[PDB]
Amino acid sequence: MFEARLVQGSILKKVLEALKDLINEACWDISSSGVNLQSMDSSHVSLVQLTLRSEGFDTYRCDRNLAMGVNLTSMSKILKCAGNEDIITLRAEDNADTLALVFEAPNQEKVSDYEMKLMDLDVEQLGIPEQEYSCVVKMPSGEFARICRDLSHIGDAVVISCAKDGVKFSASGELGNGNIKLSQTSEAVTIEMNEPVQLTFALRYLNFFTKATPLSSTVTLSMSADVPLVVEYKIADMGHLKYYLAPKIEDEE
Amino acid sequence: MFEARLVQGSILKKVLEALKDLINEACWDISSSGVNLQSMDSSHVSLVQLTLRSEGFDTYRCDRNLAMGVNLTSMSKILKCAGNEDIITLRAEDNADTLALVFEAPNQEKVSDYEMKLMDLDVEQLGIPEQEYSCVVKMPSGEFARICRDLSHIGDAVVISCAKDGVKFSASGELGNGNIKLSQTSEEEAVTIEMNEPVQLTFALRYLNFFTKATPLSSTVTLSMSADVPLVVEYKIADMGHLKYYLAPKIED
Amino acid sequence: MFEARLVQGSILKKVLEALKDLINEACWDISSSGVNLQSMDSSHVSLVQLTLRSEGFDTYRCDRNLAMGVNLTSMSKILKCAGNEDIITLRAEDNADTLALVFEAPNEKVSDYEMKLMDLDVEQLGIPEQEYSCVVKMPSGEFARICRDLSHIGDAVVISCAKDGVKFSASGELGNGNIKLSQTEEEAVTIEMNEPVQLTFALRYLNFFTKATPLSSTVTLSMSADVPLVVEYKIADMGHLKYYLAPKIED
Amino acid sequence: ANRQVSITGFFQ
Amino acid sequence: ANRQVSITGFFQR
Amino acid sequence: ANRQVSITGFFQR
Numbered sequence: 001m002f003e004a005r006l007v008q009g010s011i012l013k014k015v016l017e018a019l020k021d022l023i024n025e026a027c028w029d030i031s032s033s034g035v036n037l038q039s040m041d042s043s044h045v046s047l048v049q050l051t052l053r054s055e056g057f058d059t060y061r062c063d064r065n066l067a068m069g070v071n072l073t074s075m076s077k078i079l080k081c082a083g084n085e086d087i088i089t090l091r092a093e094d095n096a097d098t099l100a101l102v103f104e105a106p107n108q109e110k111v112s113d114y115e116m117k118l119m120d121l122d123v124e125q126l127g128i129p130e131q132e133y134s135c136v137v138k139m140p141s142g143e144f145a146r147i148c149r150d151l152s153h154i155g156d157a158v159v160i161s162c163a164k165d166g167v168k169f170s171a172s173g174e175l176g177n178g179n180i181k182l183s184q185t186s187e188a189v190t191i192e193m194n195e196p197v198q199l200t201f202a203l204r205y206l207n208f209f210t211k212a213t214p215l216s217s218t219v220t221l222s223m224s225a226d227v228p229l230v231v232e233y234k235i236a237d238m239g240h241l242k243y244y245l246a247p248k249i250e251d252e253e
Numbered sequence: 254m255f256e257a258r259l260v261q262g263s264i265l266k267k268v269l270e271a272l273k274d275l276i277n278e279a280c281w282d283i284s285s286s287g288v289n290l291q292s293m294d295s296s297h298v299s300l301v302q303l304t305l306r307s308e309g310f311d312t313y314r315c316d317r318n319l320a321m322g323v324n325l326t327s328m329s330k331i332l333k334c335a336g337n338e339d340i341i342t343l344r345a346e347d348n349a350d351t352l353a354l355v356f357e358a359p360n361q362e363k364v365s366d367y368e369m370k371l372m373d374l375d376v377e378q379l380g381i382p383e384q385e386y387s388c389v390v391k392m393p394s395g396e397f398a399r400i401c402r403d404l405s406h407i408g409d410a411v412v413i414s415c416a417k418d419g420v421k422f423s424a425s426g427e428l429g430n431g432n433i434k435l436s437q438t439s440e441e442e443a444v445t446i447e448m449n450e451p452v453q454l455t456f457a458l459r460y461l462n463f464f465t466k467a468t469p470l471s472s473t474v475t476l477s478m479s480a481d482v483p484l485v486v487e488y489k490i491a492d493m494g495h496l497k498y499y500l501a502p503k504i505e506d
Numbered sequence: 507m508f509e510a511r512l513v514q515g516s517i518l519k520k521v522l523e524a525l526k527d528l529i530n531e532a533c534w535d536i537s538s539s540g541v542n543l544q545s546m547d548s549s550h551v552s553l554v555q556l557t558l559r560s561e562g563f564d565t566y567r568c569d570r571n572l573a574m575g576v577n578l579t580s581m582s583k584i585l586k587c588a589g590n591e592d593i594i595t596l597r598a599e600d601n602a603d604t605l606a607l608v609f610e611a612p613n614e615k616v617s618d619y620e621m622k623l624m625d626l627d628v629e630q631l632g633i634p635e636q637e638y639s640c641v642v643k644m645p646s647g648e649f650a651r652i653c654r655d656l657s658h659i660g661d662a663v664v665i666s667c668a669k670d671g672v673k674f675s676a677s678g679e680l681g682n683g684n685i686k687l688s689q690t691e692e693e694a695v696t697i698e699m700n701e702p703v704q705l706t707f708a709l710r711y712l713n714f715f716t717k718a719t720p721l722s723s724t725v726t727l728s729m730s731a732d733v734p735l736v737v738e739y740k741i742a743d744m745g746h747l748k749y750y751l752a753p754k755i756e757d
Numbered sequence: 758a759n760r761q762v763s764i765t766g767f768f769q
Numbered sequence: 770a771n772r773q774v775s776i777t778g779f780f781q782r
Numbered sequence: 783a784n785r786q787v788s789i790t791g792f793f794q795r
Binding site for chain 1: 577580583584586587589604607613614615616617618619620621622
């Protein structure tokens, strides 16, 4: 019997608003450690890794390890019936194929209770190869978001070039081309370059990743030659949300 | 010759924004008592009762009793040409088949004058059977509005169950089901309930949602139900009169 | 080699948001005097005149006189990648068929956009310097509202200017209405009537002209019998933006 | 809770 | 007050 | 930078 109490319920809201457009149906792994979710996107071009540690919850409790095949769209809709201030409570029954969302409004004169139908998902599981990264860029999530929106008007893909001094994003299309340059501080931008890197990514997906912006003031980007870019947003004391995007390769001949 | 001066003209604006989407063509009964309007909705599932007492107006005046078949859509569009601070003046001629809307901007260096074409409507008149209600629920209009918006994501209809302690709204659909519970408290933030007899009735959220367009007219709204009769949804228009919405329930076959 | 530095870059943003919907492809005349642009609209019912004096720029510089056939839609899109606080820098090469837009964020970030130019054989027009019977100065917001309001009543607006004040009116299916302004700092309405005038204009275009409202607190309207109405927005110390609309004639 | 009824049936 | 006129008829090139 | 690659080509199932 699962039961978690989250006082800053807006966090849950923000999480679903960050997964719903990228993932239709996902699986929520519950355990004494906390909730966790890992899923490729529809396109199978990226992987989302959500981590909500039980510590972050104001009351966690997991008797039986659960695997809830959830329709993120239904859960999102349901979650919009919560005030950004209500206390949200996830509660399930190891025997029931339904999850329960209870929202308690601060002043407790109102309580919403939603029972969402779960589903059997035979989701294709993947395993991330723990690796090292040539470059790690920390920067305001808002700036990152803006960058991705801007370039989106120029072209479909963005070339992320990371050197010693700073990092550079650039694109090109019908209406010419452009690029944005960020340099380390001396709101700040920190860069850890062991090796200059250059990779091409689709702005379409980066733009999906950015729906997580309201989850953190900052975001870190981790790249490396010929490997998936890592876009990660921390969820203060709760855990995090990581997005892996496969790069675009140059088909030679 | 009709002539009414309304200083808080935003009231008129709010009124039309609350009728336009439910009613296409209505009849406005004018008299020395004040303006009044009663009309079934398109669907013939509900009845709207508007009451604007002459006292509320800052200058009323009705020589001949009038019946103005108005197109609420045209009147709505026209009314959007009024600032939320302009002084509005309805003025008609017993002989003219046109109503005049004059808006005076506070400063008074600007005056808008609109002559709206009336029409002959042979509207189907109905008579409300003055009756008593088992339950009357007073609550913030915003809370009520939110409740109706929330459930609308769960299903098409809402079951309003009123008991001794409190009242309950609930619905169900593809994505499961949910319900909200309100309990009495102990001004415009509290919930009062008057239960003489527990009641349970089914209504279409679609229409309740239309009724809620009146939310900006009052801080609170009262719900009056009774076994096998139309639910009454009423919004008071401070010192002017009110706006009542009657919705016929859904019956079992 | 052209190079202009504009600190209040939001001005450039506002300008394109005011031309983009009226003009698809325009020509930007650059010179030591400053940037200038004059173009009929698509419909060939109006003429836009933009004037950006070099004085207004915080760093101007024009070696060779330039004529840049610009796609205002592409330039608009590009310009939306600028913060309302970034320092914008136009820079071109007399030999390159491309204009460069560099945005410098106040605080570590620089955006650089190279926009492709194009050969435009635009049809040039010459405005006949003339005098006006009436000139009405008023808040741009009030004017904008007026045009939006009337747009719900009908397609055209009759602007009647008399001694006391000015009047706008329209009519359609749902009846008709009119707004009256009378003389009475950027909240006031001043009128200069030498001769009463009455002219009919399409609200559709007036509504395009109003996309310039965020450029000035006020706007002046200049009319005269049987001639294009002049709608002008000043661009503080930079120059201005003028819209000429041909009136509707009776048959 | 199955079929919508019209207000006419409650009063004419 | 009925037919829209083009600026070309008011302005010459 | 040409063709989009799927994460499967980097992560085994």
